[PDB]
Symmetry: C2
Subunit: 227 residues, 2 copies
């Protein structure tokens, strides 16, 4: 088996996002995907009708079945659904500090439909921020996590909250053709790029395969520049 | 969006089988996968610890969110978990007789671990057999569905039970290097082939794209001869 990325992600039946997108991205990165499903959502391209969040017990049962069997090198999270599941993931990560971890701070669906109570989820994410090898917020997620509207100030706030590295997707350098991404490591700009961007799972795959953070981010852009 | 295959399949956290394999195969066929998850299983490469079957209500809710939004052309089923879910799928298919349907009669995991009570599931599958465009049993599944050990006789029994077409995977022509597949249409041998075989979802994708059954089966073998 290839190095494995274990994904704590929700299921989108329409196949536009969620663990399906994780599987597609990780396969294309060259790694193997394993899945601990956090929720069965009821949604399509237009709206979210609702979701059934996985219990913390069933979430950890899925994850722990993978541990010891597959060569897990990295964890990726997307939709977690509940504060219980955020806490369960933190528990899992603290039991395995040797795993890398890519935090994609999903708060809402592509359609804008609810994937949980944002106020309580934002507060719960505080626990996961310092555990991540990389956090990948878009500009909306960045502001929600920090309560700061200025992008520069919000980025610094994330580092004050314990972030190790942050890939901010979008911002003042965007155009009709590209979203500009900025990679910060320990509060400093490390790479400033673009992307013709769901990058978390691909990056996780490259990290599992032994890439440096900068090399993983670059590969993910190259992948999309061919996608 | 590409033509869509809607998959009624279970989740295997280790990523060796289940809806993950459906997503990979359907993407490579050129179609789009949508998912109605029938169960969250707890398993790895070595064993099945257990599973939590999706309720018939949540199963249909996932499926119906996809209907009307995506261009569904084909349904594929794998693990269904419960007799309730087999009945729910039959209900769904009879509401949409225009969908093609590939029945992969999953009864047990790759490891040999239980995915439900085989005696009651075999009896429940009677309902789905006549609805399928194609059934894809391996030799074990073929014998279990029919209660017949002779492969030729079991195949004819499946047609007496209302089958329209059957792709039997494996048999007396197998070797250490290849499993031989036989495609029967209306009780007659239509194509006799080999395969260097989880073919159901790839075939479903090709059917969604407008291929004939024989052409879809051939494409699926060509795919593996490069995999």
């Amino acid at each position: 088996v290839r190095p494995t990325v274990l994904c704590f992600s929700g299921l989108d039946p329409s196949g536009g996002a969620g663990l399906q997108a994780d599987i597609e991205a990780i396969g294309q990165s060259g790694a193997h995907a394993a899945i601990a499903c956090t929720a069965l959502t009821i949604q399509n391209s237009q709206q979210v009708f609702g979701f059934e969040a996985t219990s913390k017990e069933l979430l950890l049962a899925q994850a722990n079945a993978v541990v010891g069997d597959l060569p897990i090198k990295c964890v990726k999270s997307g939709m977690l659904g509940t504060t219980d599941n955020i806490a369960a993931l933190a528990e899992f990560l603290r039991a395995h500090p040797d795993y890398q971890y890519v935090l994609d701070p999903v708060l809402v669906a592509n359609s804008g439909g609810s994937l949980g109570d944002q106020a309580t989820l934002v507060k719960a994410f505080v626990e996961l921020i310092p555990l991540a090898t990389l956090i990948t917020p878009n500009t909306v997620e960045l502001r929600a996590l920090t309560g700061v509207t200025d992008l520069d100030q919000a980025t610094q706030k994330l580092f004050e909250m314990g972030a190790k590295a942050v890939l901010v997707k979008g911002g003042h350098e965007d155009t009709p053709d590209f979203i500009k991404n900025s990679l910060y490591i320990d509060g400093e700009l490390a790479a400033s790029s673009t992307c013709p961007c769901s990058l978390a799972s691909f990056i996780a795959g490259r990290l599992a395969l032994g890439d440096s953070l900068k090399i993983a981010v670059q590969h993910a852009e190259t992948w999309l520049f061919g996608v």
